């Protein structure tokens with residue numbers, strides 16, 4: 001089997017991407033944030049505290065003839081930005097782009113943090129990291145991908161995120177028309193439950209490539225590119241007037257600037273992030289100070305190749321017995 005679904009930016013800055021997902025019978029379609037940095041499929045629901053729902057579409061398990069309470073199961077998750085959610089668990093039928101999993105754990109939110117409430121466009125998350133990170137207790141549950149894997153034509157999914165445009169998540173096949181050149185594959189460590197890999201270095205603009213190992217995670221659920229302070233300082237030093245602002249919470253730059261590209265290595269291959277991809281717009285409405293898309297990972301404890309990086313590539317998440325990651329230009 002295979003599946004193919006379009007993923008769409010939630011706003012003009014590509015702050016996140018949503019993908020329609022069918023849950024239950026008859027189908028209830030919710031727009032979920034596919035997140036290769038976490039492993040819970042959770043949704044706003046009829047159980048979510050009313051004051052914490054503001055415009056989201058909810059899953060109502062009582063209206064699904066295939067929903068079953070997973071007795072005694074609860075979940076609770078915190079994300080790297082300090083946001084959180086928790087609740088109980090149903091199993092139900094879940095389909096993405098024509099690919100169907102029966103008995104998928106659908107984690108129903110009873111509580112969500114304010115950041116989730118405030119994002120009316122995101123109805124929940126669909127985790128695509130390794131199932132060892134799944135938070136359901138006392139019986140850990142599998143991701144949608146893990147459940148689907150044995151049925152797929154090939155045990156892979158691909159992320160093809162657009163810049164200010166829709167893109168695609170495919171399951172079970174590699175669309176050879178979706179990228180240019182070849183796909184370069186690189187080793188993955190699953191020891192922390194992430195799609196963790198080591199970039200071979202970087203360049204700023206038309207500058208020389210610096211060969212240096214940068215361990216980080218491929219994370220579709222994180223907006224920006226978080227890299228070591230040395231690398232980030234070298235990038236922003238090429239932008240007149242750019243500075244790290246403790247009050248704003250990262251590097252900012254004059255909105256009048258033309259940003260240089262940023263290149264990262266994948267083995268002997270190179271992925272080029274155009275300068276425009278690194279512009280996240282005014283820090284507040286009407287400001288001439290703009291927020292940067294490349295930020296320091298110093299306070300995070302891990303480097304994160306988020307959407308800023310991934311959207312510059314066609315990315316293969318290879319879930320073979322020994323997982324790997326592939327990157328192509330596009």
Ligand SMILES: COc1ccc(CN)cc1O
Nearest residue numbers: 033079083115116221222
């Ligand atoms: C508040 O919204 C989010 C917070 C965290 C993640 C996961 N990195 C995804 C989101 O949509």
